[PDB]
Scaffold this active site. Structure first.
Site, short mmCIF file in Angstrom:
data_model
loop_
_atom_site.label_atom_id
_atom_site.label_comp_id
_atom_site.label_asym_id
_atom_site.label_seq_id
_atom_site.Cartn_x
_atom_site.Cartn_y
_atom_site.Cartn_z
N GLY A 215 14.85 -8.26 0.96
CA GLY A 215 13.78 -8.92 0.25
C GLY A 215 12.72 -9.48 1.18
N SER B 154 16.32 -14.22 -1.11
CA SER B 154 15.80 -15.27 -1.97
C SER B 154 16.71 -15.40 -3.19
CB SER B 154 14.37 -14.97 -2.41
OG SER B 154 13.89 -15.97 -3.29
N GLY C 85 13.48 -10.27 -7.33
CA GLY C 85 13.94 -8.94 -7.68
C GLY C 85 14.85 -8.32 -6.63
N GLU D 246 12.28 -16.61 -12.83
CA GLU D 246 13.31 -16.97 -11.86
C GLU D 246 14.59 -17.46 -12.52
OE1 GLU D 246 13.17 -16.00 -9.10
OE2 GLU D 246 11.16 -16.06 -8.22
N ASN E 141 11.88 -24.51 -0.78
CA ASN E 141 10.53 -24.50 -0.21
C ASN E 141 9.86 -25.87 -0.32
OD1 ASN E 141 10.45 -21.42 -1.89
ND2 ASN E 141 10.53 -21.60 0.35
N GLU F 299 35.48 -20.67 10.78
CA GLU F 299 35.83 -22.08 10.58
C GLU F 299 34.97 -22.73 9.51
OE1 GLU F 299 35.95 -24.28 14.20
OE2 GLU F 299 37.20 -22.81 15.25
N1 LIG Z 1 10.67 -19.97 2.82
C1 LIG Z 1 10.15 -18.80 2.47
N2 LIG Z 1 10.25 -18.35 1.17
C2 LIG Z 1 9.71 -17.15 0.82
C3 LIG Z 1 9.06 -16.38 1.76
N3 LIG Z 1 8.62 -15.25 1.16
C4 LIG Z 1 8.99 -15.29 -0.14
N4 LIG Z 1 9.66 -16.47 -0.37
C5 LIG Z 1 10.24 -16.92 -1.65
O1 LIG Z 1 10.66 -15.84 -2.46
C6 LIG Z 1 10.50 -16.19 -3.82
C7 LIG Z 1 10.30 -14.98 -4.72
O2 LIG Z 1 11.17 -13.94 -4.33
P1 LIG Z 1 10.72 -12.94 -3.16
O3 LIG Z 1 11.66 -13.02 -1.99
O4 LIG Z 1 9.31 -13.30 -2.76
O5 LIG Z 1 10.75 -11.48 -3.82
P2 LIG Z 1 11.64 -10.30 -3.18
O6 LIG Z 1 12.82 -10.83 -2.40
O7 LIG Z 1 10.78 -9.40 -2.32
O8 LIG Z 1 12.15 -9.45 -4.45
P3 LIG Z 1 11.10 -8.67 -5.38
O9 LIG Z 1 11.10 -9.29 -6.76
O10 LIG Z 1 11.52 -7.23 -5.49
O11 LIG Z 1 9.72 -8.79 -4.79
C8 LIG Z 1 9.28 -17.10 -3.86
O12 LIG Z 1 9.45 -18.12 -4.82
C9 LIG Z 1 9.21 -17.69 -2.47
O13 LIG Z 1 9.53 -19.06 -2.52
C10 LIG Z 1 8.95 -16.83 3.07
O14 LIG Z 1 8.37 -16.13 3.90
N5 LIG Z 1 9.50 -18.04 3.42
#
Ligand SMILES: Nc1nc2c(ncn2[C@@H]2O[C@H](COP(=O)(O)OP(=O)(O)OP(=O)(O)O)[C@@H](O)[C@H]2O)c(=O)[nH]1
Ligand SMILES: Nc1nc2c(ncn2[C@@H]2O[C@H](COP(=O)(O)OP(=O)(O)OP(=O)(O)O)[C@@H](O)[C@H]2O)c(=O)[nH]1
Ligand SMILES: Nc1nc2c(ncn2[C@@H]2O[C@H](COP(=O)(O)OP(=O)(O)O)[C@@H](O)[C@H]2O)c(=O)[nH]1
Ligand SMILES: Nc1nc2c(ncn2[C@@H]2O[C@H](COP(=O)(O)OP(=O)(O)O)[C@@H](O)[C@H]2O)c(=O)[nH]1
Ligand SMILES: [Mg+2]
Ligand SMILES: [Mg+2]
Lengths: 430, 432, 432, 430
Positions: B10, B133, B137, B176, B199, B247
C-alpha cells in the site's frame, strides 16, 4: 499504466474538448504540432494516460470527436491545436440534428454510431490497461444528449467493467438557450441514471456569476468558461498523471463519492479564483482555499448547497502542501457546517493531494460535491417537462422520428424517482 | 540475531518503507546505492551480493505503479532488487474486496514467489514486518491475503505489522469504517501483535513537542521509522537485556485476541529546545507515560495498562532504568490491571539514535521507545464500530463491495467479531 | 575425449550451427578466419590443416542456396571447408516427402561421402550432432535419411540431435503435425537421445528472465548455443566428474523408445540485473527445476522426472552440488518415478561460459545446464497427435505428400507408432 | 538458383506487367536502360531470379508479352521501361479478340500460341533450375481469359512438375467493364480449376475502395491500382530474391495454402497503406500491421472475409522484424477471431519474414488468404452466367467461333461444384 479515452459530442462537447486539450497539452508541455517541449521529466512519466505516442518525436491524443454536422469540428481543425488530433478520429455526419433527442439517438445518430465505436475500439486496443471513459456534452443539446447517450450505452455494454465519466452542461434555471431543453434533459437523464458511474453537472448561469463577481471579468465568453471547466476536468485526473502523497484515481473517487448507484451526480468547483486586482490583497494558503471551495458562491451549479446536505465531498489539492493544514480545515468545515452533512455518514470528506500545481499557480484545489441540493435542479426540470408534455407542446417532432409517447412518461417517472430518492436520504436517523 | 523479513504493501506502507530503509542505511553506514561506505550484524535486514553490494530484504508491493514508480526513480532505485518492486496495473480504489478477491488474487502468487526465495537464503528467520494502512484498499485487502498465505505456508514464526489506525476526528476517506473492520476480522487470527499509530497523534506531537508548523506525511514516516528501528535494535546491535523479535509477542500478548499495543517515543525535541533540557533517564521515562506524548489519540488514563515494553536505547544505565520504573509503578494516577503484577519488559541497547540529515528531530544520546498494550484502545474500537453500524444500517456503500466478489454476510460476521473483541477487553478489564 | 561430428540440416539447424560455432571459436580463441589467436583439446570439433589453420568438423546441408549462401558470404566464410557447405537446387517446400524421397535422395549420396571422409581422419569418434527442426521439410525428411544411413553405415555410436519441437500455442506453419510425426516414426529407432527445445519457451525466458523486449531467432540460437557447448564441455576441457558423450544415453534412456529429454539452463540474467543476485550454487540449482525457466512449454509439475543430468560448469564446489541436489530430492512438490531411486547424473567442468560480444546474456562465473527426461512431454505428444488426426480425418493436405512419392499408408502407421509411444509413457508413469 | 518466367497477356495483363517490372527493377536497382545501379550487393546476389544477364553491364528480364492486337504492347515499348525487354519476346497478332473467349482460345490465339511457346521454351532452357511460371491477365477480358488459359494448359502439359502462379483480375460485383464477363469468367475458371496450383483473385472495386478511404487518393488511376497489385506480387517472391530468418518460396506457400487441389483461390492484401496526412499519426510497428492486414477493409477482394472462414492464411513480412512480436499478433488473431478459422485445421497461419523492406519503407507485410468467403464471388458469377445463358443472351458469338453449347453447360456445372466444395468445407466436425 492507467489510461483513458476522451469522447466529445455536440457543439458544447467539442468546444470544451478543444479548451481541454489546450490545457492538458500545456501541463505536459506538448507543442500544438504534437512535439514535446516540456521542461520536466515528470511530465512524460505519465503522458500515455491521455496520449498515444507516435514515433518521430510526436504524440497524438486518443480522442474521438463526434458531431452530426461538420461545422463545429471544422472550426476545431482550424484551431491552434486542431492538427494535434489524428484525422481518422474526426467522425461526422451530414444532416445535423435539429436539437431533437430522437434524431441524435434513433434516426441520424444510429447510422454513424457504428463508425464511432470502431475508432473507440481501436483506441481501447491501443491501450495496455484501460481505466475508463470521459464524455463531454450538453443535456439541452440534441447531438450530445441523443448521440452521447447512444455511445454511453454501447460502450457500457461493450466495456461493463470500465468506468465512464461525464461532464454534462445542465440547463440554467433562469435563462435558457434551447426551447425544448426539458425534453432533451429528461430523455438523457433516463439513460445516464443507469449507464454511467459518475456525472459532473455544470451550468453556464453559475459560471456567469463566477466571472461577474468572483473573477471580475467584464466581457467573458465561452472561450473563458470552458477554461474554468477544463481546469476542474484536468484536476480530477491529476493523480493518474503526477505523483502525490495521497493519490486518488477515478475509481477511488467513485467509491468515495457514490454511496448508492443512482446518486452519482456531483457539482464541481475550483479555487483560487481571483481577479488581477485582487491578486495583491490575498494570501494563497490552505486556510483560504478551503473556505472558497465550500462557498456557495464558488459553486459551478445553480442550486444553492445550503438548501441541502452533503452525502460525500472530495477535495483534490495540487501543489506544495501541508497535510496537517489540509486535515485541520476539513475538520473545521465538518464542525463549523454542522447541519450541512448527513448524520448517517460520520465522515464526509475524501482528501487528495498532488505535488505539481496547475499552470503558474503554486497551489490549487478542486471541489467535488454529491450534495442533496441537486434535487431542486431535477425538480425544476420536472416541472418544465410536465408543463410542456401536459398538452404535447413539442412532441410532434419527437414522435415523427419514431419515439413513442410511452417512452416520454417512463423517463418522467424515472426522473421523479431520482428526486424522491434524493429527498429520501436527506432525512436523519434521529 | 538472524534475519528478519520486511514487507511494504500500500501507499502508506510503501512510503513508510523508504523512510525506514533510510534509517537502516544510515545506521549501518550503507550508501543509498547499496554499497557500504561509512555493526557487522547488518545481515538481519540486508543480503550481501558477494561483490561489495547489499540488497535490502524487503518486498515492496502495490496494485498501482504510481507509488512504486517514485521508488524506482528515487535515490534508492539502485538499492532494492528490481524484482522485489512488485506492482500491479489498477489500484484497489479504496475497496477491500478488490485488494482481497479480484485484483489482489492476480498478483498474490508473484509476491509469495519472491517471499519464498527470501526465506531460502535464511539461516534463521525470526519473523516478518508488514507495513500497511489499517484503512485502505491495498493496505487492508491485500495484507489479509499475505497474512493468510504466510501463516499457512510458514507458520510458527512472528508476524509483526505496523498499521495506520484511523484517527477518531481526522479522516481522509469515506468508507474507512467498512475497510478497517474487514481486515481486522481476517487479520486478527493470523497476526501476532500489530503496532498502531495515528496520523492525528503524530501531527499533535509535531506541533507541541516539535516546533514544526508545516508537517507532512514525509515527516510522519521519518518519526515512525525510529519506532521500527528501536524495535529491531537488539537484532542489529549489542547491549544488556537484549529483546529478541519473538519476545515481543510473549510479553505483550496475554491473550490470543488482544495483541494491539500502541506506540510511544521519547525524547522528541527540536534542535534549539534540546539545549534547555537535561534529558535524563527519569525525564524520558516519565514522558513515555504522558497522554501528550503517545502516538495514539486514545487517552491512556481512560483505561489500564496490561503490559509494557521499554526498549531503552543509547548510553543508559540499568540502575537508572530500574529506579525510574519503580517511580512509575508507585504513581496512583497510573493504574495497571490487577491480574498482571509484573508488566514492564525492559530492553537496553548501546546504539543512540542516528541523525537523519534535514530532519526535524534533534540529536540525542539517550532515547527510549515504549510499547504498551493498554485497554484504552477499546474506546477507539467502539467508536470505529459505531461508524460502521451507522453506515451499514442503510447500505451506504455496500453495493461497491458486493459487486467486487464479497458477500453481504461478511459485513455482519466481521462486525460481530469486532463486537466480541470489545467484550474481550471488557472481560480482562476487571478483577474481583 | 576424441572427435565428435556435427551435422546441420535445414534452415533452423544451419542457423543454429553458425551460432554454435561462434561459441566454439570464441571458447577456444579461434579467429573467425580459421586461425588460432587468443585448451589444446579443441581437436574434438576442429581439424588442423597443418599450416596454422583449423577447419570445423561440420557438414552443413540444405536443399536451397539461400540459407547456406548467407554462410558463404558471412564472416565465417573462410572458416568452413568449401565442400562441407553442401547445397541443393530446390527447397523441400515444407513437405516431408520431398526431403526424404524425391529431392532428398538426389543429394544424400554427396552428404555421406563427406561424412565418410570426416570419419577417416578420426582416431576416435564418440558420435554425431545433428541440428534440425522437428517440424519442417528439410529438417524432418532429410534428417531421417541421414539417421538411417548413419545408423547402418556406422552404427554402434552415439547420435545426438537437437530438434525445434513444435510449440503448442505458437506455430509458424500449417502442415507441421503431418511433418513432425513422419520424422518421429522414422527417427525414433535410429536415434539415441534427441534434445527438445521450443521457440515459445525461449521467447518467454527472453522476456521474463532477460529484459529483452525485441527477441529474434538470432537471440534464440545464441541462447541455444550454450546448451550444446555445455553438453560437450567435458570433451573439450578438464574437470571433476567428466561426462563423456556416450554417458548421456546410458543415464537418460531407461527404455529404447523413451529418449526425448528436455533442456533447461541457468543462470539467465541481463547485465544490470546480475548485480542484485549472488547466484550461488543452490540458487541456480533450484532455478533449473522451475517451470518458469525450462525451455519446453510443457509443465514439469504435470508429470514425474525419470532421469536428470546436471552439467555444472564454472567455479563450482562439488560439496555444494551434493547438498543442493539433496535439497531438490526432499522437495514434495517435485516427484520422481518410484522405480528410479537414483536419477541425478552430475557433471562438473572448470570452464565458465564464454561471453559473446553483443549478446543479451550477462557474464557469470558459475553456470549449470540440466537435462531431464520427464514424463510431462507425453502431454505435448498427445496435443501434437490431436492436431494430426483432426487434419488427417479429412485429408487436409495429404495430396501434396501423396504426389511426392509417399504412400497414404505411412500416415496410419506413423500415427499408430506415435500412439504406442504415448502408451509407453503411460506404462512407465505408474508403480505398484 | 530458383528461377521464374513471367507471362503477361491482354490489356490488363501487360499494363500490370509494366507496372510490375517498374518495381522489381527498382528493388534490384536496375536502370530503365537495363544497366545495374543498385547501392547494395545483396540485390545482385539473386538478380537471376527474374532476369537473364546479357554481357555488357546490362540485364534483360525474361518476360513474354502476348497480345492479339499490338495497341497495348506498342504503348509498353514507348514506356519508361519499354526498351528493357528483349524485342523477340514481344509476340503479337493482328486481329484482336472481340472480348470473346472463343476467339482468344480456338480461332485467333491458336495460330499464335505456337510462337509464344517457342520463346517460353528458350527462356526455360536459359535457366538452370526453373521453379514456376507467373501469368497476369483478367478473367473478364477475352485475350487474357482465352489466350491465358490456352498458354496455361500447354505449359502445364509441357512442364507438369513446375508451379504456375496466376494474378487474375476478377469482375467486380457492382460495376463491370465488359458486358459478357459472365461467359468469359466461367469458361476461364473451368481451365484454371485444374491446370494451375495457386491463383490470386483481384477486383478493381475493392482497389477503388482502398484508394478512396484507406489511402485518401482523390483521383486514382490504373497507374496507381497496378502499383498496389505489383507490391503484392513482388512480396510473394521476396524470399526467392533476398534473405530472411524464415524463408518461404512459391512451393512452400502452395503447400501451406492449398489444402485440396481445387481450393487454390486466394485474396491478396498489403500493409501499411496510409495517406500522406496520416503518416504523422501512425506508428509503423508489427502490432498495427497485423490488424490492418486482417481488416476486411484492407482486402483486395469484394467478398467480405467475415461472411466466411479461413482455411489457411499466409503472412509474408519484410524489413527489420521481431519474431516474438510476429508470433504474438498471429496468436492474438487466432484467439480474437475465434469463429473466423475452421476447426478441422488447428493452425491457420504460415508466417514468413524477409530482412529487406520494399522501396523506402522500413517495414512491410503481404497478406494471402484462402478464405471460404470467396464462394459468394463464384455464386454471383454463377447467377449472372445462368441468367444470360438461360435464353442464349450472347451465345451466338461464341458458337460462331466453333465453341459448342455443350462446353458451356459443363463449365457451369464445374463452377457449381467449386462453390459446393467451398460450402462443404465451411462445416464443422462438432
Ligand atoms: N503516516 C502516513 N500515512 C499515510 C501515508 N500515505 C497514506 N497514508 C494513510 O493511508 C490512508 C488511506 O489508505 P492508503 O494507504 O492511502 O491507500 P492504499 O494503502 O494505497 O490502498 P488503496 O485504497 O488501494 O489506495 C490515509 O488515511 C492516510 O492516512 C503516509 O505517507 N504516511
Ligand atoms: N530456434 C530457432 N528455430 C528456427 C530458426 N529458423 C527456423 N526455425 C524453426 O524452423 C521451423 C520450420 O522449419 P525450418 O527449419 O524453418 O525449414 P527448413 O529446415 O529450412 O526446411 P524447408 O521446409 O525446406 O524450408 C519453424 O517453425 C521455426 O520454429 C532459428 O533460427 N532458430
Ligand atoms: N461551456 C460551454 N457551453 C456551451 C458552448 N457552446 C454551447 N454550449 C452549451 O450547449 C447548449 C446547447 O446545446 P448544443 O450542444 O449546442 O446542441 P447540439 O449541437 O445539438 O449538441 C447550450 O445550453 C450552451 O450552454 C461552449 O463553447 N462552452
Ligand atoms: N486492376 C486492373 N484491371 C484492369 C486494368 N485494365 C483493365 N482491367 C480489367 O480488364 C477487364 C477488361 O478485359 P481486357 O483485359 O481489357 O480485355 P483483353 O485486352 O482482350 O484481354 C476489365 O474488366 C477491367 O476490370 C488495370 O490497369 N488494372
Ligand atoms: Mg492505492
Ligand atoms: Mg528451407
Amino acid at each position: 499504466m492507467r489510461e483513458i479515452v476522451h469522447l466529445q459530442a455536440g457543439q458544447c462537447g467539442n468546444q470544451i474538448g478543444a479548451k481541454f486539450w489546450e490545457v492538458i497539452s500545456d501541463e505536459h508541455g506538448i507543442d500544438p504540432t504534437g512535439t514535446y517541449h516540456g521542461d520536466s521529466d515528470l511530465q512524460l512519466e505519465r503522458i500515455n494516460v491521455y496520449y498515444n505516442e507516435a514515433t518521430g518525436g510526436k504524440y497524438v491524443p486518443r480522442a474521438v470527436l463526434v458531431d452530426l454536422e461538420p461545422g463545429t469540428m471544422d472550426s476545431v481543425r482550424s484551431g491552434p491545436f486542431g492538427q494535434i488530433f489524428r484525422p481518422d478520429n474526426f467522425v461526422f455526419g451530414q444532416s445535423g440534428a435539429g436539437n431533437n433527442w430522437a434524431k441524435g439517438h434513433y434516426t441520424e445518430g444510429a447510422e454513424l454510431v457504428d463508425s464511432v465505436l470502431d475508432v473507440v475500439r481501436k483506441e481501447a486496443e491501443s491501450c495496455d490497461c484501460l481505466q475508463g471513459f470521459q464524455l463531454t456534452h450538453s443535456l439541452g443539446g440534441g447531438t450530445g444528449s441523443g448521440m452521447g447517450t447512444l455511445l454511453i450505452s454501447k460502450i457500457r455494454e461493450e466495456y461493463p467493467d470500465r468506468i465512464m465519466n461525464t461532464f454534462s452542461v445542465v440547463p440554467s434555471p433562469k435563462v435558457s438557450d434551447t426551447v425544448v431543453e426539458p425534453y432533451n434533459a429528461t430523455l438523457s437523464v433516463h439513460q445516464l441514471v443507469e449507464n454511467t458511474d459518475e456525472t459532473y453537472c455544470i451550468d453556464n448561469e453559475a459560471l456567469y456569476d463566477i466571472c461577474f463577481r468572483t473573477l471580475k471579468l467584464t466581457t467573458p465568453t465561452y472561450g473563458d468558461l470552458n477554461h474554468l471547466v477544463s481546469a476542474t476536468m484536468s484536476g480530477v485526473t491529476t493523480c493518474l498523471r503526477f505523483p502525490g502523497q495521497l493519490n486518488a484515481d477515478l475509481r477511488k473517487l467513485a467509491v468515495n463519492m457514490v454511496p448508492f448507484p443512482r446518486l452519482h451526480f456531483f457539482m464541481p468547483g475550483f479555487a483560487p479564483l481571483t481577479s488581477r486586482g485582487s491578486q495583491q490583497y490575498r494570501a494563497l494558503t490552505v486556510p483560504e482555499l478551503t473556505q472558497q471551495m465550500f462557498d456557495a458562491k464558488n459553486m459551478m451549479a445553480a442550486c444553492d448547497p445550503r438548501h441541502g446536505r452533503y452525502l460525500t465531498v472530495a477535495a483534490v489539492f495540487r501543489g506544495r502542501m501541508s497535510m496537517k493544514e489540509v486535515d485541520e480545515q476539513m475538520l473545521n468545515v465538518q464542525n463549523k457546517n454542522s447541519s450541512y452533512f448527513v448524520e448517517w455518514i460520520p465522515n464526509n470528506v475524501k482528501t487528495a493531494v498532488c505535488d505539481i500545481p496547475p499552470r503558474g499557480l503554486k497551489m490549487s484545489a478542486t471541489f467535488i460535491g454529491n450534495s442533496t441540493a441537486i434535487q431542486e435542479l431535477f425538480k425544476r426540470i420536472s416541472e418544465q417537462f410536465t408543463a410542456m408534455f401536459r398538452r404535447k407542446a413539442f412532441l410532434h417532432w419527437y414522435t415523427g422520428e419514431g419515439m413513442d409517447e410511452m417512452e416520454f412518461t417512463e423517463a418522467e417517472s424515472n426522473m421523479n424517482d431520482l428526486v424522491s430518492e434524493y429527498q429520501q436520504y436527506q432525512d436523519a436517523t434521529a | 540475531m538472524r534475519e528478519c523479513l520486511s514487507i511494504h504493501i500500500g501507499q502508506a506502507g510503501v512510503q513508510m518503507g523508504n523512510a525506514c530503509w533510510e534509517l537502516y542505511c544510515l545506521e549501518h553506514g550503507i550508501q543509498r546505492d547499496g554499497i557500504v561506505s561509512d555493526d557487522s550484524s547488518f545481515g538481519t535486514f540486508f543480503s550481501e551480493t558477494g561483490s561489495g553490494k547489499h540488497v535490502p530484504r524487503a518486498v515492496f508491493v502495490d496494485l498501482e505503479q504510481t507509488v512504486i514508480g517514485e521508488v524506482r526513480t528515487g535515490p534508492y532505485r539502485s538499492l532494492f532488487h528490481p524484482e522485489q518492486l512488485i506492482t500491479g496495473k489498477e489500484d484497489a480504489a479504496n475497496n477491500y474486496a478488490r485488494g482481497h478477491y479480484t485484483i489482489g488474487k492476480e498478483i498474490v502468487d508473484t509476491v509469495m514467489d519472491r517471499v519464498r526465495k527470501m526465506a531460502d537464503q535464511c539461516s534463521g528467520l525470526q519473523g516478518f514486518l508488514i507495513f500497511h494502512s489499517f484503512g485502505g484498499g491495498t493496505g487492508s485487502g491485500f495484507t489479509s491475503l499475505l497474512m493468510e498465505r504466510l501463516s499457512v505456508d510458514y507458520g510458527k514464526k512472528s508476524k509483526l505489522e505496523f498499521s495506520v489506525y484511523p484517527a477518531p476526528q481526522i479522516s481522509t476517506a469515506v468508507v474507512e469504517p467498512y475497510n478497517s473492520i474487514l481486515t481486522t476480522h481476517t487479520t486478527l487470527e493470523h497476526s501476532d501483535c500489530a503496532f498502531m499509530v495515528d496520523n492525528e497523534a503524530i501531527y499533535d506531537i509535531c506541533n507541541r513537542n516539535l516546533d514544526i508548523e508545516r508537517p507532512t506525511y514525509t515527516n510522519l514516516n521519518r518519526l515512525i521509522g525510529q519506532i521500527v528501528s528501536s524495535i529491531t535494535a537488539s537484532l542489529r546491535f549489542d547491549g544488556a537485556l537484549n529483546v529478541d523479535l519473538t519476545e515481543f509477542q510473549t510479553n505483550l500478548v496475554p491473550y490470543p485476541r488482544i495483541h494491539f499495543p500502541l506506540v510511544t517515543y521519547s525524547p522528541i525535541i527540536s534542535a534549539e529546545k534540546a539545549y534547555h533540557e537535561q534529558l535524563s533517564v527519569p525525564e524520558i521515562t516519565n514522558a513515555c507515560f504522558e497522554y501528550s506524548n503517545q502516538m495514539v489519540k486514545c487517552d491512556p488514563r481512560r483505561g489500564k495498562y496490561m503490559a509494557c515494553c521499554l526498549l531503552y536505547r543509547g548510553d543508559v544505565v540499568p540502575k537508572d532504568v530500574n529506579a525510574a520504573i519503580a517511580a512509575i509503578k508507585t504513581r496512583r494516577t497510573i493504574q495497571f490491571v490487577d491480574w498482571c503484577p509484573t508488566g514492564f519488559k525492559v530492553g537496553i541497547n548501546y546504539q543512540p539514535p542516528t541523525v537523519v540529515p534535514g530532519g526535524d528531530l534533534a540529536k540525542v544520546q539517550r532515547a527510549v521507545c515504549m510499547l504498551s498494550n493498554t485497554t484504552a484502545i477499546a474506546e477507539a474500537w467502539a467508536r470505529l464500530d459505531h461508524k460502521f453500524d451507522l453506515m451499514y444500517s442503510k447500505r451506504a456503500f455496500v453495493h461497491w463491495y458486493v459487486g467486487e466478489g464479497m458477500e453481504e454476510g461478511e459485513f455482519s460476521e466481521a462486525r460481530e467479531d469486532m463486537a466480541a473483541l470489545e467484550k474481550d477487553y471488557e472481560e480482562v478489564g476487571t478483577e474481583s
